[PDB]
Structures are given as structure tokens and as C-alpha cells.
Amino acid sequence: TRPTIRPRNDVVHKQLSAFGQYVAEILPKYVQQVQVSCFNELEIFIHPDGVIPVLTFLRDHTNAQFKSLADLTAVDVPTRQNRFEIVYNLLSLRFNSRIRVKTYTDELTPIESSVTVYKAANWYEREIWDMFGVFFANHPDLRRILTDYGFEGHPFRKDFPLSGYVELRYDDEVKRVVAEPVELAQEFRKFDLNSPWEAFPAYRQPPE
Amino acid sequence: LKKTTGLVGLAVCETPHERLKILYTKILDVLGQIPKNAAYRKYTEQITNEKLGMVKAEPDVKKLEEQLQGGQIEEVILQAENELSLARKMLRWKPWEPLVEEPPANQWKWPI
Amino acid sequence: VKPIFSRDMNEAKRRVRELYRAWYREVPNTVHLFQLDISVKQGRDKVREMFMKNAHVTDPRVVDLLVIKGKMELEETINVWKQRTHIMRFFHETEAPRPTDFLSKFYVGHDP
Amino acid sequence: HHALIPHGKGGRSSVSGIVATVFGATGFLGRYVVNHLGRMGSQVIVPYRCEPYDTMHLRPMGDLGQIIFMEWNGKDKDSIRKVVEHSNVVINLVGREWETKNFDFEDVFVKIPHAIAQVSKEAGVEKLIHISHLNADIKSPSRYLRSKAVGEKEVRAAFPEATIIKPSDIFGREDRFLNYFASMRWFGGVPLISLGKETVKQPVYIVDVSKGIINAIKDPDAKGKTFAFVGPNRYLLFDLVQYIFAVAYRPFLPYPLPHFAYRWVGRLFEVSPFEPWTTRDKVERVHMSDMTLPHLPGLEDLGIQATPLELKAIEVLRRHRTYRWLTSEMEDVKPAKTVN
Amino acid sequence: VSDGSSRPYRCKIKAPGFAHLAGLDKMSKGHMLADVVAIIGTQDIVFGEVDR
Amino acid sequence: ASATRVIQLLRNWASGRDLQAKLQLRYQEISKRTQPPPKLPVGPSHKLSNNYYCTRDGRREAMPPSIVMSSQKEKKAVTPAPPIKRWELSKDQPYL
Amino acid sequence: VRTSPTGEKVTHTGQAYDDGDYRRVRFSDRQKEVNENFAIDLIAEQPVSEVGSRVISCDGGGGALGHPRVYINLDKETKTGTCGYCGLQFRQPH
Amino acid sequence: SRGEYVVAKLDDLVNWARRSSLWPMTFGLACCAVEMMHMAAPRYDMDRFGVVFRASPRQSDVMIVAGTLTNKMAPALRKVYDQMPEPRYVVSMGSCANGGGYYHYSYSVVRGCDRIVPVDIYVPGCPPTAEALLYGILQLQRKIKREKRLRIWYRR
Amino acid sequence: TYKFVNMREPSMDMKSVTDRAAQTLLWTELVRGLGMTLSYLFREPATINYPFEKGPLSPRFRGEHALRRYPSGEERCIACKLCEAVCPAQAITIEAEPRADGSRRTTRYDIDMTKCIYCGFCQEACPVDAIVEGPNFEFSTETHEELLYNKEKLLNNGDKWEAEIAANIQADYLYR
Ligand SMILES: NC(=O)C1=CN([C@@H]2O[C@H](COP(=O)(O)OP(=O)(O)OC[C@H]3O[C@@H](n4cnc5c(N)ncnc54)[C@H](OP(=O)(O)O)[C@@H]3O)[C@@H](O)[C@H]2O)C=CC1
Ligand code: SF4
Ligand code: SF4
Ligand code: SF4
């Protein structure tokens, strides 16, 4: 029955909710909100100061042994004052479960490096600094990865144009590859695809 | 006596029961310093006391590993050491205290 | 507000002066290693111009982050991570001069 | 008729409004002229008489479609008509410092330019730019400059409103002027007629010449005017060659040679079937002091300030340095004495 | 991350090669250049994944 | 293949296996390039009754995540999930 | 496929380079690629089908290999019904 | 003229030597390199045609720009092209190399390798099939066969 | 569930020791590898004689884009621009105007074969089967501009390859 729709597993939902309450109780100082998605994923929202403490708690077995940092990334939502949402994805092989811890930052506010806790966050935090503008304090070596050696802007920032501000070409006069202002021969055609009609009534925001 | 733990970098412990007893006792000692009503202390003590009782009750390494469900006993001792370090850092962090600051008005609202 | 490295503007100015010293001494080594055809005075003038571009900053955190970016660029130049193309990009040799007077902009194009 | 409104911000993808046929673009000056034209966004039509491989270096200079290569023959007027048919500007840079069996100095500096100018006038091209050495004169010892003066007269005849640019020795990376002096190290001492004391030269940077040509195309007043392109400073040949060897960090051994002996040596090198290392005309032109022509307008009129030889010498002459002196800075060698 | 539109708001790809190349330095300690080539081979890094 | 018996014997002996039985090169065993036209089956939702999309609308059955704890307004210790069971050595070939 | 005054072959779109235009240089020693077959002429050549029903359906031929099926009203005597996709024309007899 | 005949025959010999022995350099940026390896694989072995991959730029004759050329990699590509002795030919493989392809509007992509280095043959596709790359290489060989360096020398 | 690679202990009996000593001193395993290489020497090579021999391809192959026509000769395109919309690389530029007949036809249809990723979209997306990636793969060019196709070029390709394109579509139309 209901072949198209995805099957739901309530057992995992209850287990994740219970463990989320467990974490919230153990560290009330930093955890602000814990929610479990209906696809059975647990998210704990933390104050920026609690990254190292909460991550160290999660890695060490207080009935939780998340000893693998799946990925670390940021989501830039310009509307929010803290435009960057730092996201940590952890994996516990002992309990075969994954949880996500999320924190916020601004362009000018540093966030502590997690290289001490996990040691896989060196390159992830460097990428976060390179694309987004977040600075991670006490990082062993914070420098650019994935961008050109002289790149000035921070891409992935929702302000940076997709094509950028500069372009590279070889110039015979200087016998060198020289940057120049971007001049697209075919401007990227912006398509307005959003429909005027609401698709999901469940997520309807309050009229306010 | 198992020839190898099977995981590189982890060595067979000749005296597993003694090591586990010492580590759990130290963890309980550190937990004692933590305030009584702190959830960390209550839960960690609950887990530790269960583990220590299991370790004392069972004299066989394989039976103890089956009972603990923490993998090979060397992994259990490693987890105990990790717990001890956490407990020690917890004392400094004092996570049991109230929330440092509530988030901005709509810092966790999605969709925007 | 949480300070990045400096709690007040004077400390950030001290860091900025240290960075300027580092670049000023590095400039001749850059000309030698990268086999650049610019003179040392020309490169140091470019360094001053880059420092002067952000001379309007009045917030300590912005100044600290700028010093961090400058230190990263200096590390790139001290190593050979940046090529001669990257070093000479600061001098926009290929780009033609862009008139700034109203009449020239009016003649050339529709740009404001 | 063929008028295009300029559009864009002057980049690679922009339309400058300049449609040009650069004759002799597969050469030292043609490369820079084509690069400057392409960067603006102008359409460049390149007539090439050589193999397409030799024109490959110019392919990246322009955006897609801007650079069109069409094979042309100097002797055949119809190819000139085909190349210049749709151009609003034509630049003639066809010149060989050495005479060849098929084409002598007369053909390259007189017949070719005259045919180009006549076909351009017939086609309707608005503007024509022609290049003739500053030292060009009908009574000059060198056949090269004599033919250059005759060609200037003929081009003015065929195209009355034609800009003629008279450049001095143009020093650049691919130059045959600084490299020529530097290459003399291989032969031991540097042979100089009278030791170079009696000769004064005013070299011009290649980039300055190309920018002057482009500004002349842009400038409305340039029509029917002869410009003289000369460098900021005048040097004695001895001082200039000594500075060349100093910047190259190669030992300098100047030895005076009689003019007839130098002419005989030039005849010896003319024998080479391939590009001659030097020619009697080359020796004569090198010895001839650069003329001073205050009447003609110069680079300053076109808005370009001439770059001094000191600034750009290292670019040309660093390659001639050995491993020991490859990394030496430009400032190590002081500027040469200037006869100004 | 989806904003309810037809286009994803954010897509972050976790490439296995990223962390392996990060650990390459730790793995290489105490080895020679050929050992470094072998270690690069062992972690099976395709740099399209690493750089994205 | 077209190998002579002598070459087949030499190759098989050198390999230590019978190469002829499993040949890397492909011969008449491959499927014919032209195939009979297919008749692909329809899916579960191809019905003329009792098929209202409201019943089978998966996307509209998604809901905003449930909030277990919110800061803005004995118990047994719990784990993220039941501890993983140890793997069992394969019967077919425990050791390679 | 008519030829313009310049000698260029005008495309089905009607595109031909004016004598003033400098872009004709691109074909100087190369050719301008023009499809001789013009859709308008060929669609005109097809005979008009006469059907005895007020509404008819055109699928473009070949069923699923053609175009979406559309129904055409043929009531108007003055003008033949034309398929939006195929371009074929139909009219009621008499 | 007898001189013209001698020049034409010597040019034929030189062009035959250069096209028969085409040594691409071991330069692969992106997914298109895999199709290049499959071209080197037994099915379409390029060694039959005389195309042998040689690592050193100075010992190579052709550069195949297989994969996207980022703004970071462009100076290295130009350096490798310059260090390659002449005659040197460049083949651009894949949409990414030809004009930027899927990442044309990216900040970190050069919209074509033609901007950095001159290109002789463009092989379309994303990824171009190994047969397509072999066709492009043979087309480059024919282009070399059509070269007239010595004839032009004689006529000049 | 899990298997142990390695994790085997050599026998210490004198015969096994002598065998391993012979392997070390007498290089047996290297000889086995040499024999494998020799056997490959005597196996038939897998090289195909391109261009004379061409590698297998299926009817669903995605190659050079082509614009098809109806059997009448009318162009199938109805200027939907949905095929432009679905193009992942924005390689299709379409402009349309009512034609003299009054039909919805494309004044401009351009596919940049240098921005195309040959995804196969717009063959699935296009409603009337107008745009099809045909069998051709050997359309290499000596200039970048040759690869910026035009409506005329695409229609010429469709006319050139219609015989093969129709047969392939017939082969795979039921699977779609
Ligand atoms: N210092 C200077 O450079 C000075 C410049 N000039 C003039 O300006 C130009 C500068 O060129 P330069 O920098 O010397 O480089 P080149 O000597 O390479 O210039 C010659 C150019 O014209 C072509 N060409 C040469 N001979 C013929 C011919 N017989 N028929 C057709 N085309 C021919 C060459 O192509 P190809 O190799 O295929 O023949 C090349 O593109 C020359 O015309 C020169 O006389 C004047 C005074 C000084
Ligand atoms: S063109 Fe296609 S196959 Fe080639 S590198 Fe780019 S994405 Fe990969
Ligand atoms: S199927 Fe092709 S021709 Fe027809 S409307 Fe769509 S893109 Fe245009
Ligand atoms: S197959 Fe070609 S035209 Fe169609 S969507 Fe892909 S890139 Fe665009």
C-alpha cells in the first residue's frame, strides 16, 4: 500500500528524540534547540561558544561516540543577522547513528576551530573560510583552498555573482596570464521559475 | 589471550579487568567533583556504575565483552579513558549552567 | 562584540604596522625571486597603495581580518605559491585607463 | 558606409567599432597591434602569406570571431581587395629588413604599400596607417630607407588622407635591434664602425608604437598627418651597446672596424638562404644616426608618454643573461649616458 | 537544503577524497618520494571530488 | 578465438588456466543488436478508480521537523540507537 | 531560397547581410550555411485533407512519434483548419 | 621548377615524420582524461598510429587539454605549453576545455582554453568518446600533412 | 558479513620452508608473472582498426544535436522554449516570431556545442521530437566558432542524418 510514498520508521524517530533530550539535559549551557526531522535526522542547535564543548561531549562516550566528522559546512542566509550557519555532521559507528549540530556566526565574529576535537576539520574549516567569510580561531593553518592564489572575494556567499568579478586570459604584450573585469559574451539568463501558487500548505508561514 | 585486537594501533591489554576497574573508579572520582544535580554526573555515574558492576561480576574477557556490548575489551578501555578526559574537561566547562544566550529573533527559522 | 585579535584600534594599528614592515622587507626578495621587472621602489609603492586603500577602516575587527588576509597573501608571496601572474596582477598593466571625468564617461558609454 | 557604433566597456567581448586589416600582422609590430586591437573588442582581419602555423600565436588575441585570417599575396591586388573590402581601417606593416629573391626592397616598401593604398581607396576604407622609418629619405645610403621614402610618397599619392607613422628602432622582446647587438657576443668582440661614438639613436618601445597606432586610429585629427615615433632619450651607439651588454651582464669588447670591412662582413652574411643575420643595409642603417624632425608630431600628441629604454631593457635582454645573472634586478645597472 | 522552490538553496558535497588527501601528510611521514606516489595511489583521490 | 592448438596450449600452460573457456574478446555470444520491440509495464498509479492523488501525494505528507527541546519557552541514560552488533566472519570464505 | 542584392543567400528566417554590414567578411573565403529546404513552401505544398466531421484530430503521424494530439474545428467554410503543430490543413467537404 | 619539387618532397617527408610520430604530453585535467586513457587502452590503442604519451613537456609534441581549465590551473598550462618545443600543436577535448561547458558561468573556470593557449583542433563532447578523440588526432595529422613550411620558404 | 584479507600464517614445516626458500632464491613468483605476460602475448589483440572499424553504439547514443522535420517537410519545432529551459548548461538560445503562414516557428535556434554537456535533455524535454542528439560523434572542428551551431546548421544536420535518426528513434521510442 502507498507504494509511491516513503515508508516511515517511528522507532528511529523516538530513539533520536530521546537522545536529543539526553544531550539537551547534559549540556543546557550551549544547546538552544533540538529537533528531529520526519526523515529521522537529529539536529541540535548550539550557541557559537559551545562548538568545542558540545563536540567533545559528542565524541566521548556519554552514551554517544560520534567519532567521525562526516562533513562541516556553512549555509549563508543573508536575511539573518548571523548570515552564516555552521553545520557539523557527525557519525557514531558504535551506535550506527548520525546527528547534526548547527551554530551561527557573523562576518566579523570568529568561531573556535574544531581541529583539536576531530582533526578532520582543518581542510573543512579552511574551505569554509575560503568560500564563506567565516574565520576559525586557533586554527593550525587557515589559508585558501579551492580558490585562486590571489582571489579576493569569498564565493558561495550569495552576494558573489556566479561569474565573479574577474576573468583570466593570456596577453602576448606582457607574456603573462592577466586578470581582467568579467565580460560575458552571453549573459547568464536568469529564469524566474517559482510558481505564484503555494505548493506545500504544511509549511505556510504565519501571515503576520 | 587474543593475538591481536584486529584494529591497527590498538594493542591487547594483558590485565583488562584491572585497567577497567581503575579507569571507572577514576571516572567516578572526577564525577564526584561535579555538582550533584548536573545531568552529566547523574547519567555518566549511571553508565559507569553499570559498567563497573559488569566488569567485577564477570571473570571472562569474552563474556564481559558480550555483556558490555562495547566491542573488544581494549576498545572499552579506550572509551573509558576518553570518558575520563571528557569528565575532566567538563569540570572546567561547567555545561550544567544555564544557556549562555538565547539566539537572535529568527536565527533558526527555515524557510526564510 | 568579541575581538578577533585586538580589543581596541591601537592594537590593530600595531598589528598593521607589523604587517607593513614584513611586506616592506619582503618586496626586494619578491622582485629577485619572481624575476619581476618592476623596481623595488615600485613594489613598495604598490604595497603602500594597497595599505592605503583600506585606510578608512575604523572598526578593530575589520582591521584584524584585513591583517589576517594580508598575512596570508604575504605567506603566499614568501613561498612561490603565487606565480608572477598573481604578483603582477596588483599592477593592472593590461587594463586600459578608465576616465573618471563626467564628460569622458558620457562620451564612452552609458555607464553611470 | 561601414560604420559601427561602439558598445560595451572596452573589454574582450565589447565592440570597439574598429574593423581593421593589419597587413604584416605576423611580425614584431603586428603582434602588439593585433593584441591592442583585440583587447578593445575590434574586429581584426589578418592577411597572411606564411604557413597558418606561424599565425597561431595571434589566434588567442581576440574573442570568438574577432580575428579572421585570410591568405593574401602582395603581388595580387585581388587578394588585397578581398582583405580590405569590409574594413573601416587598414594598417600596412609589411617590411623585410633583408631583400629576397622574389621580393626586393622596392616591392616590399614601394609596390606593396602603393597597391594596398590604391585598393583601399577604391574599396572605401576610411582610414589607412602606414609605417616608414624616421630615417627614411630618398638620398639615404641604405636602400631600405630610400624605398621607404619613395613608398611614403606613393602612399600619400594614392591615399591623400593617410596617417604615416615614422618610428625609430623599436626595442622589444622580439626586437631585432637589442637582440642584434646582444647576439654580437657570440662573435667575440662587438664590431662598431668608428666605435659607435659618431652615431646617435633614439629607440622607441614596441608597446608605445602600437598604442600610438591605436590612438591614431581613434584620433580624428590624425588623418593626413605624419607622426614621428621616437624614444625619450637619445644615446650614442657606443653607450647604448655598452648598456645592452651591461644589462645582459655579458662582457663588452668594443673594437673599431672600418666601414668597408663591415660592409664586406654584411655581404658575407647576406649569402645565407635563410633569414640573414646581418646585411650591408643593416650595417648602414645601424650606423646612420637617427634624424631629429621637430616639425612632425610625436607620441605626446597621441597621448602616450614614451617609456624609457631603462625601464624595459631587462625584459628584452634578460634571456641573453647567463644563469649567474638571470635573477639580477633591473636597478643594478645604472642608466647609460644620454646625448640630449 | 531546500527552501521549497524548484532549485536547491544549498548543496554541499562530502567527497571521500577530501579527508584522505588531508591525511596524506600524516600518512607520508617517514617515507620517500616513491612511497608518497604509492600513498597518493592508495587513497584513490579523484580531484573533481576533492575540489568540486 | 582463431588460435592454433599449439598456441592455445602454450598460452594455457603459461597462464596456468584454460584461457579458451573464458575469452576476453567477445564473439557470437553477444546479444543481437536488433531486438524485438518492448512492451514496458505501467506502474501502480495507472488505475481508473480509487486513484485520487490526495491518497498518494508523498510531498504533501512531509511535515516541518518536530521540536524535541526549545530554550525559548531517575531517568535512564539513553543512546542514539541500540549498540551495533558485531559482524560475523563470512562462512563462504572467512580468510582470503 | 532567394538571393539578396549583395549576392548572399537569404535564409528562411529572412536573414541577409546588408552591404553596409561589415559582418559579411566572415564568409569571405568561407560559405554561408543556408538550408535550401524551406518549411513554409513545403507546408504549403501539402494537399488539404477533406474530412466529413466537424472536429478532427491530428497527431502529426506516427502516433507517439508525432506531436501532441489536438482536435480541430472545421465549421468555418471560408478558412481551412490548420494544425497548430503539424501545419497540415483540413476542411469539410463542400 | 626542380627546386619547387625538391622543397615539396622534403616538406612531405618532414610532415610525414611529424604526423606519424605525435607524442602527446601526459596532461589530463578532468573527466575527459579518462576517455583519453581509454583511447590509450587496447581497443583504440593510439600507439598503433604513433601517438605515445610522454610526460616531459620538452619531449612532447602535442598538448591535449582534457578537462576544465580553472583560473588557478591556467598559468601552469601556459607554462607547460611554452616549455614545449616546437613544432607544437594543441588539441582541446571536451566542452569544458573548448568553451567552458557545464561550468561556463563559474568564477573559477576559464571559458575556453583558447583564451590561454592557441588551439588547433577542437573535439566536441562531454566527455568526447575515445573514438571522437582518435578522430580529432587523425584530423590534426591531416592538418600537419597539409602544412607547407618549406614551400612557403622557397616562395618567400 | 566480513572477510579477512591477509590474516594467514605460513606453515613452519621443513617442506614449506624449503618451498619459500626456493621462491626467494629461485624467483618463482616473478616467473609466474612472466608466464602471464607471455600468455597475453599469444592472445589475440583487442585493437579495432579505426577508422575502418568502428566501436559498438546503441540507438540511445547522444551525439551531435539535430533539428528534425515532419514527413511533410515542415520543421517540427513549435518554439516551446521548454527545451531551452531544461538545458543544464544554458547552451540553447531560442527566439521566435509568428511566421508568414502564422505558425509558431523559431527565428533563432542556436546550440553552443562548446557549452553543451550532451546530457540528452531537450530530447526528452522537447514535446514534438524536433531536437534530437543524433548518431554522429566525429564532428571535430579546427576553429571554436565552427562549434557554435546555428538553426541552419542544425537543420542541415537533421536533413543529413534523418535516415539514421528516424531508425534509432523507432528503435528506442517504445522505451521512452
Ligand atoms: N623598428 C621597427 O620595427 C620599424 C618598423 N617599421 C616598419 O613597420 C613594420 C614593422 O615590422 P617588424 O616589427 O620589423 O616585423 P616583420 O619584419 O616581421 O614585419 C613584416 C611583416 O609583413 C610580412 N611580410 C614581410 N615581407 C612580406 C612580403 N614581401 N609580402 C607580404 N608580406 C610580407 C611578414 O609576414 P611574413 O613573415 O609571413 O612575410 C610580417 O607579418 C615593417 O613594415 C617595417 O618596415 C619602420 C621603421 C622601424
Ligand atoms: S567536458 Fe564533461 S567529461 Fe569532460 S571534464 Fe568537463 S564535465 Fe567531465
Ligand atoms: S522541441 Fe526543440 S524545436 Fe520544438 S519547441 Fe522544443 S526546443 Fe524548440
Ligand atoms: S543535449 Fe545539448 S542541447 Fe540538449 S540539454 Fe544537453 S547540452 Fe543542451
Read off the C-alpha cell for C58.
575604523
Omega into D258 within 30° of 0, i.e. cis? no
First to last CA, chain G: 35
Contact A136, A125 (CB under 8 A): yes
Interstrand relation of A68-76 and A84-92 (parallel, antiparallel or unpaired): antiparallel
Query: Are C82 and A149 in contact (CB < 8 Å)?
Result: yes
State this model's resolution in angstroms: 2.9
In a 10 Å sphere around its CB, with 0-12 CB exposed, 13-18 middle and 19+ buried, how is residue I103 labelled?
Answer: buried
| Bridge pairing between strands A166-171 and A136-137 | unpaired
Contact D68 G19 (CB under 8 A): no
Side-chain half-sphere exposure of C72, counting CA atoms within 13 A:
20
Q: Whose atoms come closest to the Cα of I122: which ligand? A: 4
Secondary structure (3-state) at A41: strand
User: Which residues from B are below 8 Å from E3, CB to CB?
Assistant: 110-112
> Cα(A21)–Cα(B35) distance, rounded to whole angstroms?
20
D30 Cβ below 6 A of ligand 1 = yes
Q: Residue F81 in 3-state DSSP?
A: coil
Q: Contacts of residue F72 in chain B, CB cutoff 8 Å?
A: 102-103
Using a CB–CB cutoff of 8 Å, tell me whether B91 touches chain A: no
Cα distance from N-terminal residue to C-terminal residue, chain A: 40
Cell of residue D48, nine digits:
597572411
Angle made by CA atoms A47, A53, A57, in degrees to the nearest 5: 120
Strand ranges (DSSP E) for chain D?
Answer: 19-23, 43-48, 67-71, 89-92, 127-131, 163-167, 170-171, 190-193, 200-201, 204-205, 226-229, 235-236, 254-257
Task: Identify the experimental approach.
Answer: cryo-EM
Tell me how close the Cα of I172 comes to any Cα of chain G, in angstroms. Answer: 11
Do strands D235-236 and D200-201 pair parallel, antiparallel, or not at all (unpaired)?
Answer: antiparallel
Query: Considering CB atoms only, which of E1, E14, E22 is closest to A75?
Result: E1
In this structure, are residues I144 and H98 in contact, taking their beta carbons and an 8 Å threshold?
Answer: yes
Backbone angles phi, psi at A176, to 5 degrees: -150, 155
Q: Interior CA angle at C52 toward C47 and C53, to 5°? A: 100
Residue H97 alpha carbon to ligand 2 centre in Å: 8
Distance of CA F94 to the CA centre of its chain: 23
- Cross-strand partners of H65: H92
**Cβ neighbours for B76, distance < 8 A, ≥ 6 positions apart:** B16, B20, B51, B65, B68, B70
Backbone angles phi, psi at D277, to 5 degrees: -60, -45
Q: E30's torsion region: left (phi>0), alpha (psi -120 to 50) or beta?
A: left
**Helix pair angle (B16-33, B39-57), 10° resolution:** 160
| I42 belongs to an annotated ligand binding site | no
The secondary element (H helix, E strand) that includes residue A26 is helix A10-26
Cell of A177: 596570464
Q: Flag if A17 and F66 touch (Cβ within 8 Å).
A: yes
Residue pair F96/I5 in contact (Cβ under 8 Å)? The answer is yes
Q: At what angle do helices D237-247 and D309-317 cross, to 10 degrees?
A: 50
- C-alpha C38/C-alpha C51 separation (Å) is 19
- The half-sphere exposure of I145 on its side-chain side, counting CA atoms within 13 A, is 12
Integer-rounded Cα Rg, in Å, for chain A is: 21
I126 CA to middle of ligand 4, Å?
Answer: 11
Which of A10, A43, A91, A95 is the best residue to mutate to test the F interface, defined by the most F CB atoms within 10 Å of its own CB? A95
Tell me the C-alpha distance between D311 and D301, whole Å.
22
Separation between Cα atoms, residue H139 and residue H49, nearest integer Å: 12
Do A178 and C89 touch, CB atoms closer than 8 A?
yes
Report how far residue D213's alpha carbon sits from residue D92's, in angstroms, rounded to the nearest whole number: 11
Euclidean distance between CA atoms G20 and C111, whole angstroms: 28
3-state secondary structure I142-155: CCCHHHECCHHHHH
Of H135, H70, H132, the closest CA to residue H96 belongs to H70
Indicate which of I72, I142, I165 best probes the interface with G, i.e. most G CBs within 10 Å of its own CB: I72
Ligand 2: distance of its center to the CA of H96 in Å? 6
Say which of G19, G26, G28 has its CB closest to residue D82.
Answer: G28
First-residue to last-residue Cα distance in chain D: 47
State whether the Cα torsion E24-E29-E33-E38 is positive or negative: negative
Q: Which of D61, D63, D173 is opposite residue A185, by nearest beta carbon?
A: D63
Residue among I82, I83, I116, I150 whose CB has most ligand 3 atoms within 8 A, to mutate: I83
Distance CA H131, CA H133 (A): 5
Q: What is the rounded CA–CA span in Å between residue D215 and residue D162?
A: 14
Nearest to D120 by CA among D221, D222, D2, D28: D2
Find, among I86, F41, I174, the residue nearest to G65 by Cα.
Answer: I174
- Give which of D222, D18, D23, D195 is closest to D114, Cα–Cα: D23
Residue with cell 658575407: D268
Q: Do A186 and I85 touch (CB under 8 A)?
A: no
Query: What distance in Å separates the CA atoms of residue H111 and residue B75, rounded to the nearest whole number?
Result: 53
Ligand 4 pocket, Cβ-based, cut-off 6 angstroms: I 65, 87-89, 91-92, 111, 116-122, 133
Distance I123 CA to ligand 4 centre (A): 8
Where residue I128 falls (left for φ over 0; alpha for ψ -120 to 50; beta otherwise) is alpha
- The answer to whether residues C23 and C75 touch, using CB atoms and an 8 Å cutoff, is no
Residues of G comprising the binding site for Zn(2+)? Answer: 58, 67, 83, 86
What spacing in Å lies between the alpha carbon of I118 and ligand 2's midpoint? 10
CB contact under 8 A, E19 and A120: yes
Nearest to H140 by CA among H12, H13, H10, H15: H15
Residue G53 grid coordinates: 466531421
- Tell me how many residue pairs between chain A and chain D have CB atoms under 8 A apart: 30
Nearest to residue B47, comparing CAs of B64, B30, B28?
B28
By most ligand atoms within 8 Å of CB, the mutation choice from I114, I117, I157 for ligand 4 is I117
Ligand 1: atom nearest CA of D27 is: 18
CA distances to A161, C104, D188, F75 from F78, rounded to whole Å, are 47, 74, 90, 9
Measured from CB, residues less than 6 Å from any atom of ligand 3 are: I 76-80, 82-83, 106, 122, 126-128, 130-131
Nearest residue on chain A to D40, alpha-carbon basis: A183
All 3 cell numbers of residue B31? 564525577
3-state SS, one letter per residue, for I42-92: HCCCCCCCCCCCCCCCCCCCCCCEEECECCCCCECCCCCCHHHHHCCCCCE
Q: Is residue A41 within 8 Å of residue B112, measured between CB atoms?
A: no
Residues D201 and D204: their CA atoms lie apart, in Å, by 10
Cα–Cα distance for residue pair E44/E17, rounded to 1 Å: 7
> Quick one: closest CA in B to F83, which residue?
B69
Confirm if D298 and D228 have CB atoms less than 8 A apart.
yes
Helices (H), D73-205: 77-84, 105-106, 112-123, 143-158, 178-183
Q: Which residues of G participate in the annotated binding site?
A: 58, 67, 83, 86
Interacting residues of H74 by C-beta distance below 8 A, sequence separation 6+: A168, A170, A177, H110, H116
A51-59 vs A10-26: helix axis angle to the nearest 10?
Answer: 120
Which ligand 1 atom minimizes the distance to the CA of D132? 46
CB contact set of C77 (below 8 Å; sequence gap of 6+): C26, C30, C87
Query: Within an 8 Å CB–CB cutoff, is residue A169 touching chain H?
Result: yes
Distance, in Å, from the CA atom of D26 to the CA atom of D51, rounded to the nearest integer, reads: 10
Whether D170 and D209 have beta carbons less than 8 Å apart is answered as: yes
Residue tagged 558561495 (cell numbers): A156
Containing H/E element for I39?
Answer: helix I28-42
Contacts of H70 in chain E (CB under 8 A): 51
Which chain I residues contact residue A189 at CB under 8 A?
90
Instruction: Test F83 with B69 for CB contact under 8 angstroms.
Output: yes
Q: Do chains D and C touch (3 or more CB pairs under 8 A)?
A: yes
Q: Are the beta carbons of B46 and F77 separated by less than 8 Å?
A: yes
Contact assessment for residue E26 and residue A127, using Cβ atoms and an 8 Å cutoff = no
